[PDB]
């Protein structure tokens, strides 16, 4: 009849993962009554303009040879360092490989992606270079942009020894800094769901074609195994590469966060479904869903073209992972950044495990099967109206909890005990103009 | 605590898609808070007995050659026109290709389906002929029935430029007419869920079998790639072809609508689940689930027959599409129709889109993130008791809305404000006998 | 506003499938309004130490030859009969093949499983032998353990003629007996969810490799169809074979039932989700999810190793079946059993069907579309706190129904009419110590 | 009705309701000779049936009578050709089809 | 509970078979285009009897006559391959089994 304390703790960490008050860790209030272990991974990364020693090439040059550094094409990347730059980060719902960093010389027209599978994508301290024409870069080409993945190794080790898992919350903070007199630049942020799913795409097989010139062997075996089969299953993410562009994100979403670069960002990525069931760890190769090339039977075709159906271009990331379903994909863009910047990424990912018997997690479990559907309904009705991102320093939201949770906790059905808490109005998040007001009209003075 | 106006509008269009009052268009009340574009496709088709110019053959004759018209076997189809005929329409949950029309000389024993993939299935104005023995028809065979698909091209164009979609409602009206003194015939209608799903079936590969008679080449490479693999994924629909027959539908379902032919029909197809999540457009080849031929490991078998597991016969429709899950499959049969009939199909399909950034839909969006779980519960408890179909002219249901929605809106949980609206009783839909009574016993006089 | 009688009947049969009062049969209270047939399969099996005539070998010996009995290696199995033994049963959610029996000479270190596909797994009256080293047993090896499946043929026959199905409840009783003065032994029991799912794993193809020594034929066709494709889809069950061991189950779960062997067991397997949608019968080969052997792209690899992604070892059971999703997997262990024991397994499985039109089930249907979300919520909040198993004779739970159902029926939301029923406390299930108390502290005297 | 054979398909659809009623059997025996042999195809759901006819005959068998008088019973006139049809209680039957 | 529905009408030639000695050891024999006589029947009004014996299988027996018969005749000679509903079997005018080239 009334929301529990565990429900409040879960809501607080789910909506404000990196808030200062959220020190303890709590699990999903579904009352599964199973013995679970809740892990909290906090990581920090001081990303900046990479030096030459941490910069590899993904072309066919480093194909069978391992990672190849740049053969002093680094002069061109210094030429990048002469001017302003752009810095995108893409937070896919992948459990490990939490974010993808990407550096551009100028604002890209659209979020391009290589068509050939890159060789040896690099974890964060190293980067990997791509040519300007959306192609893999070998030494001697003309570099277009840089990319890297931010990897959490402990998450991999724990996911190895776990029967099931589910993501509880994830937040990403972007403390930005630059030398004095070089603070110019903008920042944009947006979340959006991606109907990523396990998919296998149609491919064609190789058939031997023998015309036996042998004297005794006149078989002329032309057996045709060249039929249509399924590729290995891959997790495909439909991200709108054209609409992942800066301007498209800005105009598309009314909750898109925009501010000056020095404000940083803070994205508490949110789920998109009421229920959060457990899943077994099934790491699979990730891929990005292009635009379909063979229409196939989508038009009246002969009775033989039914095989090569509506297949799509698949951009293979050459990264294997298991993703948290129903969680939003986040993305921020830093535009016009001074080349000698310094971005302190701070990620906090809290997630639940069912430990495999006799595994390392089995000793750290905790038995608190709290059940609270009031909190679940509160989150369900709160998700659609929370902002997508906030400035870096805007933790410790006063309106959360005492007011917002209480204000929405009285809506659901007949589960209302307190008569009335507070009217709820439309917030106006204008970080550019400094006319920002919260969910109750109270102005937000700038703390930093 | 009380159902909103948006909830009422959504319920009204979901239960009565083609009602006269439902002029405006409203979205699903889940409060996804995303920027969506809601499209409303209304189409009309005056289907009748096709002339010879719009009648192609699906046999191996039109295999590599495109569509082939009938080489004046049309005399037999005129002989059909001498007697009465039967007209089935099958509304699968496919987004485009809204319905499948099918014409028979007499009532079929069962809803047969070709085993070989037909060549060039035809959109509505043209038809495609099939032989009597459930085989593809080449010129010179003996025609068994005709078939066609009703295609919406705008739906295809819009589904191209959309990150996600979900079907809001769909209704099909069947205004029937015939020359005076030839109004004889019956009509039957029924909806039923089909657990259609993405499936890939086991197939076998082709292996080269070389016995090298070459003098220097004595390899005799007999390498066996002839293993078991997966076909390309297809959307398989388990429709009960034996139980899609007329009599089986009549006896099976107590909500099956039956009437005289001149009454037409009006099927507001209904969902079968409470939630309606967004889905990315994934058009795939459609197929119908036959009866499994290789039992495989379903019986104690040798350790080598585990490969060819329980595979089923797959009837390939040679039509690629993406379907709306959790929506019922509808079917109506017109029996004993006069051959010179005239059926005005009127389809209305309203569905939501998430527009891809920079796409054509992005300019037509609308920002009304209404949330109303009362309406969702009302629909959930109303679905099981609505009739499957109504006569063609029975729009503007008085009992809907002011009474039925209100009567059921007070059931759910404690979300009840109004004390009591009206008792709810068992309706008796007897369109044959003219003893029809609605959900409150009020008789329904015949308006047409 | 108040839970119906149908809701009470469904809850009673779902939580106490083999209780004496549950004589009538009732369906899921979701109000699907469809015409359904509810079937109740009760089976009994007097399992004991098998004789030599019912004991086949699964090695390559019985590969193409059918089932091969043991060539009088039965002396070793008699030597087993000299000492104590261990008897595991594993109740997977498979519809047919309800349980897997397994006999060991002593307590196994872990629930091993053969890596090669066994030949002709045997239904219950016969068994199949496996070697000590987790390998298939041919005549002349050294036997390690015995295994068998308990098969329900009527379930197969009915599942053939059904458009859809869903499992309503399933219970397994273990009446144990042994000769006087040989009642020593322990019994342990545990349920746990398994995220079993349809999966296809990466495999590699066979390519012909021809160097044409033919005089006229100098093609040297070395065409490489040796690419990566998908195996046939299989239902993979992630069971923790290391944590399916006795001690791991005992320590892991606080609801694990433990007692003396003579007490038997009674496991009412429970679902793990609120909703229970219908599913079409899709029998597929079952397999057990090992530990992945090829990491693949989980580490930075060359642009060519993306194909052989994170593949797992797959233990193929050589048994095809369709499973009930969201139902727990149960397992009991009998330890130190006297070799001349007698276990009376009593299984009761009640499940719903949608009959295919014109099929055998179509005549036995029943039209009671009751809707009761109160009962669904009651089950949802009751699942996490019910014990995993009870002694064999502990049917007819007094606390169920009049108190427990009523006590929890007042929690959900505002759907509360009766003021207060009874306080609910923590039960203490200690069958070893005879200090057992139910959900209201009332002690449970031993009826047997 | 069937007595299922063990292991057969019928065995999964049994019903335990051994109800006993001499009154119903006696009423059926009494009424067998009164009901007409057939009706028009559309003439189901008779008003007189059950609450009226079965009741008004249920006291006749022996003296198994609790309610004193339910309803007098008269000979019907099933003149379907002449549209002059009257049921067991004289109530005219207007054409419903 | 078995509920069944059938749509009986004047059968086409493909659903008629001969009961005479023609299809004695041979399986059912379709009419050798004596169907013109049945069309002659279709010229005028017909008669349709159904006889519901207490048989569990074979719920009813349908029968079509050119014109009302004086009695429910039957053939002293056993018919060959009696036909389940969608197919019919023809009997001659003289109350005997019908081979092709007789008077139905």
PDB file of C-alpha atoms in Angstrom, chain A residues 66-244:
ATOM      1  CA  UNK A  66      49.142  -7.704 -35.242  1.00  0.00           C
ATOM      2  CA  UNK A  67      48.443  -4.061 -34.428  1.00  0.00           C
ATOM      3  CA  UNK A  68      50.576  -1.694 -36.524  1.00  0.00           C
ATOM      4  CA  UNK A  69      51.373   1.820 -35.318  1.00  0.00           C
ATOM      5  CA  UNK A  70      51.350   4.713 -37.780  1.00  0.00           C
ATOM      6  CA  UNK A  71      54.500   5.048 -39.896  1.00  0.00           C
ATOM      7  CA  UNK A  72      54.784   8.718 -38.940  1.00  0.00           C
ATOM      8  CA  UNK A  73      51.697   9.846 -40.752  1.00  0.00           C
ATOM      9  CA  UNK A  74      51.210  11.478 -37.346  1.00  0.00           C
ATOM     10  CA  UNK A  75      52.110  14.772 -39.026  1.00  0.00           C
ATOM     11  CA  UNK A  76      48.595  14.920 -40.466  1.00  0.00           C
ATOM     12  CA  UNK A  77      47.098  14.263 -37.043  1.00  0.00           C
ATOM     13  CA  UNK A  78      49.229  17.066 -35.654  1.00  0.00           C
ATOM     14  CA  UNK A  79      47.713  19.200 -38.401  1.00  0.00           C
ATOM     15  CA  UNK A  80      44.403  18.184 -36.858  1.00  0.00           C
ATOM     16  CA  UNK A  81      45.757  19.415 -33.543  1.00  0.00           C
ATOM     17  CA  UNK A  82      46.322  22.816 -35.144  1.00  0.00           C
ATOM     18  CA  UNK A  83      42.583  23.468 -35.500  1.00  0.00           C
ATOM     19  CA  UNK A  84      39.488  22.649 -33.473  1.00  0.00           C
ATOM     20  CA  UNK A  85      38.204  19.081 -33.288  1.00  0.00           C
ATOM     21  CA  UNK A  86      35.037  17.123 -32.570  1.00  0.00           C
ATOM     22  CA  UNK A  87      34.616  14.350 -30.012  1.00  0.00           C
ATOM     23  CA  UNK A  88      31.711  11.914 -30.122  1.00  0.00           C
ATOM     24  CA  UNK A  89      31.036   9.231 -27.567  1.00  0.00           C
ATOM     25  CA  UNK A  90      28.473   6.519 -28.205  1.00  0.00           C
ATOM     26  CA  UNK A  91      27.200   4.555 -25.213  1.00  0.00           C
ATOM     27  CA  UNK A  92      25.708   1.387 -26.608  1.00  0.00           C
ATOM     28  CA  UNK A  93      23.990  -0.963 -24.155  1.00  0.00           C
ATOM     29  CA  UNK A  94      26.972  -3.313 -24.339  1.00  0.00           C
ATOM     30  CA  UNK A  95      27.937  -4.550 -20.885  1.00  0.00           C
ATOM     31  CA  UNK A  96      31.673  -4.490 -21.377  1.00  0.00           C
ATOM     32  CA  UNK A  97      32.968  -1.977 -23.936  1.00  0.00           C
ATOM     33  CA  UNK A  98      30.872   0.600 -22.140  1.00  0.00           C
ATOM     34  CA  UNK A  99      31.416   3.490 -24.577  1.00  0.00           C
ATOM     35  CA  UNK A 100      32.922   4.152 -27.987  1.00  0.00           C
ATOM     36  CA  UNK A 101      35.097   7.243 -28.279  1.00  0.00           C
ATOM     37  CA  UNK A 102      35.574   8.900 -31.642  1.00  0.00           C
ATOM     38  CA  UNK A 103      37.644  11.925 -32.666  1.00  0.00           C
ATOM     39  CA  UNK A 104      37.091  13.981 -35.813  1.00  0.00           C
ATOM     40  CA  UNK A 105      38.969  16.892 -37.387  1.00  0.00           C
ATOM     41  CA  UNK A 106      35.705  18.747 -37.952  1.00  0.00           C
ATOM     42  CA  UNK A 107      32.054  18.024 -37.387  1.00  0.00           C
ATOM     43  CA  UNK A 108      31.126  14.979 -39.485  1.00  0.00           C
ATOM     44  CA  UNK A 109      28.251  15.128 -41.920  1.00  0.00           C
ATOM     45  CA  UNK A 110      26.937  11.837 -40.539  1.00  0.00           C
ATOM     46  CA  UNK A 111      28.026   9.004 -38.262  1.00  0.00           C
ATOM     47  CA  UNK A 112      29.797   6.965 -40.904  1.00  0.00           C
ATOM     48  CA  UNK A 113      30.922   3.402 -40.314  1.00  0.00           C
ATOM     49  CA  UNK A 114      33.416   1.172 -42.079  1.00  0.00           C
ATOM     50  CA  UNK A 115      32.051  -1.454 -44.444  1.00  0.00           C
ATOM     51  CA  UNK A 116      35.035  -3.807 -44.241  1.00  0.00           C
ATOM     52  CA  UNK A 117      35.621  -5.397 -40.865  1.00  0.00           C
ATOM     53  CA  UNK A 118      38.391  -3.471 -39.077  1.00  0.00           C
ATOM     54  CA  UNK A 119      41.463  -5.277 -37.801  1.00  0.00           C
ATOM     55  CA  UNK A 120      42.162  -5.200 -34.062  1.00  0.00           C
ATOM     56  CA  UNK A 121      39.857  -2.526 -32.626  1.00  0.00           C
ATOM     57  CA  UNK A 122      41.677  -0.938 -29.724  1.00  0.00           C
ATOM     58  CA  UNK A 123      40.773  -0.564 -26.075  1.00  0.00           C
ATOM     59  CA  UNK A 124      40.807   2.961 -24.769  1.00  0.00           C
ATOM     60  CA  UNK A 125      44.451   3.927 -24.097  1.00  0.00           C
ATOM     61  CA  UNK A 126      45.223   3.001 -27.689  1.00  0.00           C
ATOM     62  CA  UNK A 127      43.201   4.215 -30.646  1.00  0.00           C
ATOM     63  CA  UNK A 128      42.617   3.070 -34.196  1.00  0.00           C
ATOM     64  CA  UNK A 129      42.635   5.261 -37.269  1.00  0.00           C
ATOM     65  CA  UNK A 130      40.165   5.334 -40.157  1.00  0.00           C
ATOM     66  CA  UNK A 131      40.485   7.036 -43.523  1.00  0.00           C
ATOM     67  CA  UNK A 132      38.441  10.035 -44.607  1.00  0.00           C
ATOM     68  CA  UNK A 133      36.339   8.067 -47.114  1.00  0.00           C
ATOM     69  CA  UNK A 134      34.880   5.707 -44.517  1.00  0.00           C
ATOM     70  CA  UNK A 135      37.475   3.034 -45.252  1.00  0.00           C
ATOM     71  CA  UNK A 136      40.053   1.211 -43.187  1.00  0.00           C
ATOM     72  CA  UNK A 137      43.329   3.100 -42.905  1.00  0.00           C
ATOM     73  CA  UNK A 138      46.683   1.642 -43.874  1.00  0.00           C
ATOM     74  CA  UNK A 139      49.925   3.548 -43.504  1.00  0.00           C
ATOM     75  CA  UNK A 140      50.210   6.113 -46.272  1.00  0.00           C
ATOM     76  CA  UNK A 141      46.485   6.819 -46.604  1.00  0.00           C
ATOM     77  CA  UNK A 142      44.871  10.087 -45.515  1.00  0.00           C
ATOM     78  CA  UNK A 143      43.443   9.732 -41.987  1.00  0.00           C
ATOM     79  CA  UNK A 144      39.807  10.628 -41.454  1.00  0.00           C
ATOM     80  CA  UNK A 145      39.085  10.011 -37.785  1.00  0.00           C
ATOM     81  CA  UNK A 146      40.107   8.060 -34.701  1.00  0.00           C
ATOM     82  CA  UNK A 147      38.131   5.554 -32.669  1.00  0.00           C
ATOM     83  CA  UNK A 148      38.475   3.496 -29.517  1.00  0.00           C
ATOM     84  CA  UNK A 149      36.479   1.403 -27.073  1.00  0.00           C
ATOM     85  CA  UNK A 150      36.398   1.811 -23.309  1.00  0.00           C
ATOM     86  CA  UNK A 151      36.690  -1.665 -21.824  1.00  0.00           C
ATOM     87  CA  UNK A 152      35.897  -2.949 -18.342  1.00  0.00           C
ATOM     88  CA  UNK A 153      37.870  -6.153 -17.716  1.00  0.00           C
ATOM     89  CA  UNK A 154      36.309  -6.977 -14.369  1.00  0.00           C
ATOM     90  CA  UNK A 155      32.909  -7.053 -16.042  1.00  0.00           C
ATOM     91  CA  UNK A 156      34.220  -9.713 -18.409  1.00  0.00           C
ATOM     92  CA  UNK A 157      35.690 -11.774 -15.581  1.00  0.00           C
ATOM     93  CA  UNK A 158      32.461 -11.642 -13.585  1.00  0.00           C
ATOM     94  CA  UNK A 159      30.228 -12.340 -16.576  1.00  0.00           C
ATOM     95  CA  UNK A 160      32.249 -15.489 -17.196  1.00  0.00           C
ATOM     96  CA  UNK A 161      31.183 -16.917 -13.822  1.00  0.00           C
ATOM     97  CA  UNK A 162      27.471 -16.144 -13.767  1.00  0.00           C
ATOM     98  CA  UNK A 163      24.370 -18.127 -14.681  1.00  0.00           C
ATOM     99  CA  UNK A 164      22.384 -14.958 -15.327  1.00  0.00           C
ATOM    100  CA  UNK A 165      22.655 -11.202 -15.200  1.00  0.00           C
ATOM    101  CA  UNK A 166      20.625  -8.046 -15.507  1.00  0.00           C
ATOM    102  CA  UNK A 167      21.667  -4.417 -15.684  1.00  0.00           C
ATOM    103  CA  UNK A 168      20.396  -2.312 -12.807  1.00  0.00           C
ATOM    104  CA  UNK A 169      21.650   1.145 -13.737  1.00  0.00           C
ATOM    105  CA  UNK A 170      24.359   2.918 -15.682  1.00  0.00           C
ATOM    106  CA  UNK A 171      25.541   6.507 -15.656  1.00  0.00           C
ATOM    107  CA  UNK A 172      28.239   8.351 -17.566  1.00  0.00           C
ATOM    108  CA  UNK A 173      29.813  11.634 -16.468  1.00  0.00           C
ATOM    109  CA  UNK A 174      31.912  13.839 -18.694  1.00  0.00           C
ATOM    110  CA  UNK A 175      33.944  16.290 -16.610  1.00  0.00           C
ATOM    111  CA  UNK A 176      35.410  18.553 -19.279  1.00  0.00           C
ATOM    112  CA  UNK A 177      38.398  20.851 -19.040  1.00  0.00           C
ATOM    113  CA  UNK A 178      40.667  22.865 -21.301  1.00  0.00           C
ATOM    114  CA  UNK A 179      43.477  25.392 -20.883  1.00  0.00           C
ATOM    115  CA  UNK A 180      42.380  28.877 -19.937  1.00  0.00           C
ATOM    116  CA  UNK A 181      41.386  30.999 -22.964  1.00  0.00           C
ATOM    117  CA  UNK A 182      40.433  27.811 -24.858  1.00  0.00           C
ATOM    118  CA  UNK A 183      37.111  26.893 -23.267  1.00  0.00           C
ATOM    119  CA  UNK A 184      35.123  27.410 -26.471  1.00  0.00           C
ATOM    120  CA  UNK A 185      32.891  24.619 -27.738  1.00  0.00           C
ATOM    121  CA  UNK A 186      29.424  23.113 -27.445  1.00  0.00           C
ATOM    122  CA  UNK A 187      28.101  19.836 -26.074  1.00  0.00           C
ATOM    123  CA  UNK A 188      24.983  17.911 -27.065  1.00  0.00           C
ATOM    124  CA  UNK A 189      23.535  14.741 -25.594  1.00  0.00           C
ATOM    125  CA  UNK A 190      20.680  12.406 -26.391  1.00  0.00           C
ATOM    126  CA  UNK A 191      19.302   8.985 -25.518  1.00  0.00           C
ATOM    127  CA  UNK A 192      17.169   6.806 -27.745  1.00  0.00           C
ATOM    128  CA  UNK A 193      16.118   3.176 -27.750  1.00  0.00           C
ATOM    129  CA  UNK A 194      17.580   0.824 -30.357  1.00  0.00           C
ATOM    130  CA  UNK A 195      15.633  -2.306 -31.259  1.00  0.00           C
ATOM    131  CA  UNK A 196      18.836  -4.326 -31.254  1.00  0.00           C
ATOM    132  CA  UNK A 197      18.298  -8.035 -31.620  1.00  0.00           C
ATOM    133  CA  UNK A 198      19.900 -11.352 -32.438  1.00  0.00           C
ATOM    134  CA  UNK A 199      19.900 -11.756 -36.202  1.00  0.00           C
ATOM    135  CA  UNK A 200      21.401 -13.983 -38.849  1.00  0.00           C
ATOM    136  CA  UNK A 201      21.552 -12.665 -42.391  1.00  0.00           C
ATOM    137  CA  UNK A 202      21.331 -14.614 -45.626  1.00  0.00           C
ATOM    138  CA  UNK A 203      24.618 -15.573 -47.292  1.00  0.00           C
ATOM    139  CA  UNK A 204      25.583 -17.822 -50.192  1.00  0.00           C
ATOM    140  CA  UNK A 205      27.678 -20.973 -50.165  1.00  0.00           C
ATOM    141  CA  UNK A 206      30.682 -22.104 -52.205  1.00  0.00           C
ATOM    142  CA  UNK A 207      30.112 -25.064 -54.526  1.00  0.00           C
ATOM    143  CA  UNK A 208      32.827 -27.071 -56.245  1.00  0.00           C
ATOM    144  CA  UNK A 209      32.639 -26.954 -60.059  1.00  0.00           C
ATOM    145  CA  UNK A 210      34.606 -29.859 -61.546  1.00  0.00           C
ATOM    146  CA  UNK A 211      34.823 -30.845 -65.205  1.00  0.00           C
ATOM    147  CA  UNK A 212      36.946 -33.974 -64.805  1.00  0.00           C
ATOM    148  CA  UNK A 213      39.470 -34.066 -67.653  1.00  0.00           C
ATOM    149  CA  UNK A 214      40.788 -37.309 -66.135  1.00  0.00           C
ATOM    150  CA  UNK A 215      40.871 -40.229 -68.561  1.00  0.00           C
ATOM    151  CA  UNK A 216      39.103 -42.686 -66.260  1.00  0.00           C
ATOM    152  CA  UNK A 217      37.370 -39.875 -64.378  1.00  0.00           C
ATOM    153  CA  UNK A 218      34.715 -38.383 -66.657  1.00  0.00           C
ATOM    154  CA  UNK A 219      32.318 -37.585 -63.807  1.00  0.00           C
ATOM    155  CA  UNK A 220      32.312 -33.817 -64.457  1.00  0.00           C
ATOM    156  CA  UNK A 221      30.915 -33.333 -60.950  1.00  0.00           C
ATOM    157  CA  UNK A 222      29.305 -29.886 -60.980  1.00  0.00           C
ATOM    158  CA  UNK A 223      27.478 -30.391 -57.681  1.00  0.00           C
ATOM    159  CA  UNK A 224      25.938 -27.117 -56.527  1.00  0.00           C
ATOM    160  CA  UNK A 225      26.173 -26.536 -52.809  1.00  0.00           C
ATOM    161  CA  UNK A 226      25.978 -22.852 -53.828  1.00  0.00           C
ATOM    162  CA  UNK A 227      22.688 -22.345 -51.990  1.00  0.00           C
ATOM    163  CA  UNK A 228      21.424 -19.813 -49.460  1.00  0.00           C
ATOM    164  CA  UNK A 229      22.254 -20.305 -45.785  1.00  0.00           C
ATOM    165  CA  UNK A 230      22.421 -18.285 -42.579  1.00  0.00           C
ATOM    166  CA  UNK A 231      25.457 -16.474 -41.237  1.00  0.00           C
ATOM    167  CA  UNK A 232      26.559 -16.849 -37.645  1.00  0.00           C
ATOM    168  CA  UNK A 233      24.137 -15.072 -35.289  1.00  0.00           C
ATOM    169  CA  UNK A 234      25.122 -11.510 -34.461  1.00  0.00           C
ATOM    170  CA  UNK A 235      23.649  -8.819 -32.256  1.00  0.00           C
ATOM    171  CA  UNK A 236      22.514  -6.128 -34.683  1.00  0.00           C
ATOM    172  CA  UNK A 237      21.875  -2.578 -33.499  1.00  0.00           C
ATOM    173  CA  UNK A 238      19.684  -0.342 -35.661  1.00  0.00           C
ATOM    174  CA  UNK A 239      21.324   3.012 -35.019  1.00  0.00           C
ATOM    175  CA  UNK A 240      20.309   5.865 -37.323  1.00  0.00           C
ATOM    176  CA  UNK A 241      23.749   6.785 -38.598  1.00  0.00           C
ATOM    177  CA  UNK A 242      22.285   9.586 -40.685  1.00  0.00           C
ATOM    178  CA  UNK A 243      20.169  10.693 -37.701  1.00  0.00           C
ATOM    179  CA  UNK A 244      23.009  10.176 -35.205  1.00  0.00           C
TER     180      UNK A 244
END
